[PDB]
Amino acid sequence: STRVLKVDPLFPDEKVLKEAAELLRNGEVIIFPTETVYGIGADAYNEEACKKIFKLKERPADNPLIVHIHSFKQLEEIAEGYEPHLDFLKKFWPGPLTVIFRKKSEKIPPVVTADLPTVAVRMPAHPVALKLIELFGHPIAAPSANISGRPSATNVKHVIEDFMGKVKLIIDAGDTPFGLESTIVDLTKEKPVLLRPGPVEVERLKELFPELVVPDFVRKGNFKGRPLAPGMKYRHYAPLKPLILVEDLTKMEEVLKKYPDHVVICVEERKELYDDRIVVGSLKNPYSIAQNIFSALREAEKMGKEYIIVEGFEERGILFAVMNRLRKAATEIVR
Numbered sequence: 001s002t003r004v005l006k007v008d009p010l011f012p013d014e015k016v017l018k019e020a021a022e023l024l025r026n027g028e029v030i031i032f033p034t035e036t037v038y039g040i041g042a043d044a045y046n047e048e049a050c051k052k053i054f055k056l057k058e059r060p061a062d063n064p065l066i067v068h069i070h071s072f073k074q075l076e077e078i079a080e081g082y083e084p085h086l087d088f089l090k091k092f093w094p095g096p097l098t099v100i101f102r103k104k105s106e107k108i109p110p111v112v113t114a115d116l117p118t119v120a121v122r123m124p125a126h127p128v129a130l131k132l133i134e135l136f137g138h139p140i141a142a143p144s145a146n147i148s149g150r151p152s153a154t155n156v157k158h159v160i161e162d163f164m165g166k167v168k169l170i171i172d173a174g175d176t177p178f179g180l181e182s183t184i185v186d187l188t189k190e191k192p193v194l195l196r197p198g199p200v201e202v203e204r205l206k207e208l209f210p211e212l213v214v215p216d217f218v219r220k221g222n223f224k225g226r227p228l229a230p231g232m233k234y235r236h237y238a239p240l241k242p243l244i245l246v247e248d249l250t251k252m253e254e255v256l257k258k259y260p261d262h263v264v265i266c267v268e269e270r271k272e273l274y275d276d277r278i279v280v281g282s283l284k285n286p287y288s289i290a291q292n293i294f295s296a297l298r299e300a301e302k303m304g305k306e307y308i309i310v311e312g313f314e315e316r317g318i319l320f321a322v323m324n325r326l327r328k329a330a331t332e333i334v335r
């Protein structure tokens with residue numbers, strides 16, 4: 001019996017946010033916008049309400065949730081060992097950055113953290129998310145709003161495809177600004193570790209952290225063992241049709257001929273090269289490509305074609321993050 005309430009992204013109707021806060025108080029799951037992707041959230045201190053997130057997403061128990069906060073004072077409650085990183089955190093928060101810390105809070109149950117001694121924490125730069133958290137009065141545990149393994153919802157149409165009739169409330173604030181999930185950095189080890197590339201660019205983190213480690217699974221998508229964050233273990237971001245990622249574009253002639261029943265996801269500058277194609281954005285504006293990629297995967301899988309074929313991009317700036325997503329999605333990679 002799902003309700004969809006439109007709110008302004010800058011000054012949302014506090015009445016809609018109070019309705020959402022009341023649902024959260026009742027141990028219900030709601031869907032809300034951020035600057036990255038839509039989230040599906042519960043009271044972070046409510047065990048049974050956080051289990052409902054796992055059940056609703058068809059999500060493996062060992063994939064932990066990000067705890068969304070609105071103030072530095074809430075970070076003092078839920079984490080420890082962060083005092084040396086506060087100057088850093090204050091430069092990027094609120095914003096599209098998630099950090100892994102040692103868990104303090106007795107109050108955040110093991111289901112949220114997948115029984116790990118660490119917690120993933122984000123302060124999102126979206127007035128709707130910040131105002132909801134503050135009105136509700138507890139942190140919100142929220143993964144991406146999508147069935148697990150599917151592309152992350154960046155607008156209410158995608159949320160509706162996955163969750164109509166399954167959640168009481170969806171707050172609609174339109175297309176998310178970035179269209180890609182937060183950068184994840186582990187700050188619990190001697191050297192900081194990138195776990196998921198995102199809108200906070202690898203190049204920027206390397207300026208601040210010369211010793212930043214970038215593990216193989218970030219450049220390949222191939223992690224086994226116990227994941228410390230979202231977006232590491234399992235198939236992700238995947239359309240309902242086989243995804244062929246083409247890193248080496250000189251084989252694009254050969255791929256199209258090997259997989260005849262195709263639609264191509266391509267850039268504006270190569271649009272008049274393919275008969276059937278979805279234009280995801282321009283190479284002159286890489287943020288356009290990040291903004292639309294999950295959308296493009298969802299249109300593409302509805303074109304009644306057997307195979308979705310995607311152009312590769314430079315492993316640089318925001319396109320690093322795009323390629324990480326496409327590699328975790330791809331049924332085949334032509335390199």
Ligand SMILES: C[C@@H](O)[C@H](NC(=O)O)C(=O)O
Binds near residue numbers: 066122142180182
């Ligand atoms: C809901 C949103 O904040 C998202 N969550 C996730 O991908 O698990 C992110 O980190 O950008």
Ligand SMILES: [Mg+2]
Binds near residue numbers: 143144152230231
């Ligand atoms: Mg996700």
